[PDB]
Design a protein around this ligand. Structure first.
Ligand SMILES: [Ca+2]
Ligand SMILES: [Ca+2]
Lengths: 485, 485
């Protein structure tokens, strides 16, 4: 394949994320023949490590993905390390040293990617110094991969955006959102625009409601410290959920370039309604998990690091409204929570029932296009057909498809996809500033109500699919959640 | 359930059809509780049999469908017999005797069905005498079930129609076509009108071509005597194929009453183009099977009762054109033959490929809605999705559904459906005069060319899917048969 000539610098190169996903993902790009000779990886972090020590860290990292050691070793030859304080402007001369050293050693003509796998407070600082201290390539490209989260509210996000724009242009900024990197999520556009029957139907004249579900069986487990002030609202809704909604609600772009895609997604984002207190109470539901049927499923308030008086939401379900002609009156439902019935990430498009009367007891029902993203890719299409009865009558049947073992095993993991995409300069699978800002403005209105405690906090048994208020939310529009568990 | 009060008279009540399908089908209606007390079955034929002998014939007939003998015996109590010459006007007084005897014995208020399971030459004669000799009920209804074939050309069909109309009205005439009685064939309307996404797409703006296939693995076997002058053209195309096309090409009716259904089907039939010699050669292909790979698959010319110089068609494939706005330029392909790769009866709706360019190597392809009627009901929907590759690319995937064992075993056989429908006065699943006449006019134009031998007779290996001319036919419009075997 075509050789990818790039030089990547990993800030926080000794962190768990780098060990678990980053390095192994880069290894795959090498094993697939993309990364060959003209590439180098420069790790950097607080602790001290010599090249031998770092390479051993990398060796362990890719161990469970190594088939031939001689290949692993060939790969490891492209790694280097430098201890570095990101707040120390002077210390950047050391990093610049390593980067240029690698550039000459492997003959890489610019093309630099700086991956910030560090705490958010360092994002702005690192960006400033990459530019002021001359770490940016004068030839080729310069791309910055910003790890989650991009802000904690609109103000903090806008602030971050301003800092980053002092050193980079928005098209050089690659915000990490692994859900956008999921194979099935990238199928949405193909299913829609690739099939006229769905393409022409992706609107208010055919769709009754859209449903996005990100449910997990696990509780807070250990992240309670941070999760207690984030909740389902910021941990899963603001980021992952809103970006999936973006692919679903986008207008039909004028081409498939990331530029036209983003413009189409923004057409929808810019039409999203922001709620006030009364609206939040009407269109949104927040809840916290109680005990399940088994004692080991203890209520949220009894988890480690959780304040006994916490009103944090471990579940969020709400309705979105897009003020666009094509979505006029079409409710987009989203739900995400912990300690639910199953672990899934899916999209359910509920089509309006036909109005042609067959004169049967059971008249036509709503067809449903379900796209299962996690755990295993699957696509289901519920259609109206004839029941096997003596008198003519209709019934719904389910057409299905599921990724094969061959395809399941060939599917690239999100981090490999994201890194690979950045190297190619493809932002299709990344959120842009406009989407992030709107997502924040949308969520901020909701958060404001909760912090003020001007909305109820429902409860629900661990193992169920959420509070009854979640069902009642859809019932008000004559809708119901497709997935029951 | 609601009791079906009816009196049925079976002409040719000792024939193989009556034994194999007719009586067992009637038994099911009894076992299902439809037929209870007020019903009677009067068999009649040439040979002599007393009530004991006939009842024993019925007993053997329903033997393989009997669970409780006491139930079978209860059913058999409603049968009677009379030897009768259908050409003998006087002898009709004997049949009238038995019918009225049964009517009083079981207290049946009219509601008579006369099933003509006899050679076609007797159809007109029997009809005349049912009326002239006073066998028609003066109360309730009077329905005539005409066994296949309804004519052998338009003239002979029109002639038959005129004879039957001397005694009955067209809505009292129930022409037998068992394919129309197949469960899956009745699903077509539900799939279309029951799902807006398909309903709005059932036209030239979305469909590239429609395909109807009735393939069999068996050769002529034993029916060569009659088949040699009928061929695939009259044996499967004129009847079964054309009636399936009727459900596919019909306009959207104003309701689901058989009246509006027939009107919608006729709107299409009346728009069907009739071919001249040049057109037949262009849009149609006729073929005769040769040897397969195994010797036991001998060519048609070596079958028993087949003339060594025969130019009979054991395979027909052709293109139909409907001069209706919704089908403007949409080719309807039909094919039927013996000694083919598989035994199937299916419909393949090939949708036009989308024109949205993703910039991939493989752009969008044609989606396909396949409805498998025989042997086992199944529905497949081929859609465009994303391939599991590194670079964005499209591919087709197959969504599927197949009747369950529960549904397979609950499905009524065509003859039970047809008889049951006649008892209820439902003509939805029956061809009307208009459809039959057009089907004949269409086929007659083709037959004329063949009898004159002004078209080629292709050959094909037994076990293949037909002559290469069949593929070349679709290739000319940039189409190909979905089913390959
Ligand atoms: Ca509402
Ligand atoms: Ca043509």
């Amino acid at each position: 394949v075509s050789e990818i000539k790039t030089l990547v610098t990993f800030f926080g190169g000794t962190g768990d994320l780098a060990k678990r996903k980053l390095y192994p993902s880069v290894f795959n790009l090498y094993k697939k023949g993309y990364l060959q000779k003209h590439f180098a990886i420069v790790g950097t972090a607080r602790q001290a490590l010599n090249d031998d020590e770092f390479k051993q860290l990398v060796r362990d990292s890719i161990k469970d993905f190594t088939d031939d050691q001689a290949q692993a070793e060939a790969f490891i030859e492209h790694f280097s390390y430098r201890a570095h304080d990101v707040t120390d402007a002077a210390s950047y001369a050391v990093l610049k040293e390593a980067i240029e050293e690698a550039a000459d050693k492997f003959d890489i003509d610019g093309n630099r990617i700086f991956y910030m796998s560090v705490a958010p407070r360092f994002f702005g600082t690192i960006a400033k110094y990459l530019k002021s201290e001359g770490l940016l390539a004068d030839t080729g490209y310069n791309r910055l991969m910003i790890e989650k989260p991009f802000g904690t509210s609109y103000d903090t996000a806008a602030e971050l955006q301003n800092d980053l724009e002092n050193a980079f242009d928005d098209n050089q900024l690659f915000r990490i959102d692994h859900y956008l990197g999921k194979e099935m999520v990238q199928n949405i556009a193909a299913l829609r625009f690739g099939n006229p029957i769905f393409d022409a139907a992706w609107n208010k004249d055919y769709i009754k409601n859209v449903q996005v579900t990100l449910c997990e069986v696990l509780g807070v487990e250990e992240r309670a410290g941070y999760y207690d002030t984030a909740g389902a609202l910021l941990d899963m809704i603001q980021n992952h959920t809103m970006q999936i909604v973006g692919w679903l609600a986008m207008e039909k772009p004028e081409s498939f370039t990331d530029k036209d895609i983003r413009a189409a997604k923004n057409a929808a984002f810019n039409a999203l309604k922001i709620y006030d207190e009364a609206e939040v109470n009407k269109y949104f539901v927040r809840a916290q998990y109680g005990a399940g049927d088994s004692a080991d499923f203890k209520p949220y308030l009894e988890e480690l690091d959780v304040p006994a008086d916490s009103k944090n939401n471990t579940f969020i379900a709400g309705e979105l409204q897009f003020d666009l002609p094509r979505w006029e009156g079409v409710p987009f439902y989203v739900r995400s929570g912990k300690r639910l019935a199953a672990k899934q990430t899916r999209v359910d498009i509920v089509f309006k029932a036909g109005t042609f009367n067959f004169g049967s007891e059971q008249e036509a029902q709503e067809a449903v296009l379900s796209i299962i993203i996690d755990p295993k890719g699957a696509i289901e299409l519920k259609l109206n057909a004839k029941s096997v009865e003596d008198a003519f009558n209709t019934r719904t049947i389910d057409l299905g498809w599921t990724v094969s073992d061959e395809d399941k095993k060939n599917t690239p993991e999100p981090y490999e996809r994201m890194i690979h995409d950045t190297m190619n300069g493809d932002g299709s699978n990344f959120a842009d500033w406009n989407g992030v800002s709107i997502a924040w403005k949308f969520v901020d209105a909701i958060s404001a109500v909760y912090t003020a405690d001007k909305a109820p906090l429902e409860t629900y048994k661990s193992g169920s699919m959420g509070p009854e208020a979640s069902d009642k939310l859809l019932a008000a529009n004559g809708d119901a959640w497709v997935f029951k568990g």
